[PDB]
């Protein structure tokens, strides 16, 4: 008799696992500087 | 008549595809406040 | 004579590779403005 037919093709392999999460974005820049403080108090009265 | 020999083992299965790319990272934290503002101007001299 | 038996199934395909890492996240937004500065120093005596 003749040789048999080849068997079926093998099962496919599964997808690889999902990749790792990307690294967190970096912290943002500082805000702008605060406003200047209040003017100081007047000095004490002087003589003349 | 005599039975023929068995057929060949089948061809190998398809390779699996790469996993999905991971999700991109989160947006970074907001930045801290800006620096404290500069000290106020000195007061005026006292009056007379 | 009779035909030979069909061959067995092929070997399975390999699993796919893990996915790439995600891209790094977006940089955070700027922070708020800073706090107000301290009050200024007192002025000098009148006539200074």
Task: Please tell me about this protein's structure.
The complex is a heterotrimer, with 2 copies of chain A (48 residues) and 1 copy of chain B (48 residues). With 48 residues, chain A is mostly loops. Helix content of chain A is 0%, strand content 0%. Chain A has no helices and no strands. The termini of chain A are far apart. Chain B is rod-shaped. Chain B has no helices and no strands. The N and C termini of chain B lie far apart (137 Å). With 48 residues, chain B is largely without helices or strands. The interface between B and C is large, with 48 and 48 residues.
E-strand count of chain A = 0
* Radius of gyration of chain A (Å): 40 Å
Total of DSSP H or I helical runs spanning 4+ residues of chain A: 0
Distance between the termini of chain B: 137 Å
Number of helices of chain B: 0
Strand proportion of chain B, as a percent range, falls in under 5%
Largest sheet of chain A: none
Helical/strand content category of chain A: little secondary structure
| Portion in strands of chain A | under 5%
Give the oligomer, counting copies of the same chain as homo and different chains as hetero.
heterotrimer
PDB class: protein binding
Keywords: Collagen 1, Heterotrimer, Discoidin Domain Receptor, Von Willebrand Factor, protein binding
Assembly: trimeric
Entry title: Atomic resolution crystal structure of a BAA collagen heterotrimer
Summarize the structure.
Chain A is largely without helices or strands and 48 residues long.
Which short descriptors sum up this protein?
heterotrimer, A: 48 residues, little secondary structure, 0% helix, B: 48 residues
Topology:
The complex is a heterotrimer, with 2 copies of chain A (48 residues) and 1 copy of chain B (48 residues).
Chain A: no helix or strand
Chain B: no helix or strand
């Amino acid at each position: 008799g003749p040789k048999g037919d080849p068997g079926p093709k093998g099962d496919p392999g599964p997808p690889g696992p999902p990749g790792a999460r990307g690294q967190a974005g970096v912290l943002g820049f500082p805000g702008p500087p605060g406003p200047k403080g209040d003017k100081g108090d007047p000095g004490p009265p002087g003589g003349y | 008549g005599p039975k023929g020999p068995p057929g060949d083992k089948g061809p190998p299965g398809d390779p699996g595809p790469p996993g999905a790319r991971g999700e991109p990272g989160n947006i970074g934290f907001p930045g801290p406040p800006g620096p404290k503002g500069p000290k106020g101007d000195p007061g005026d001299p006292g009056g007379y």
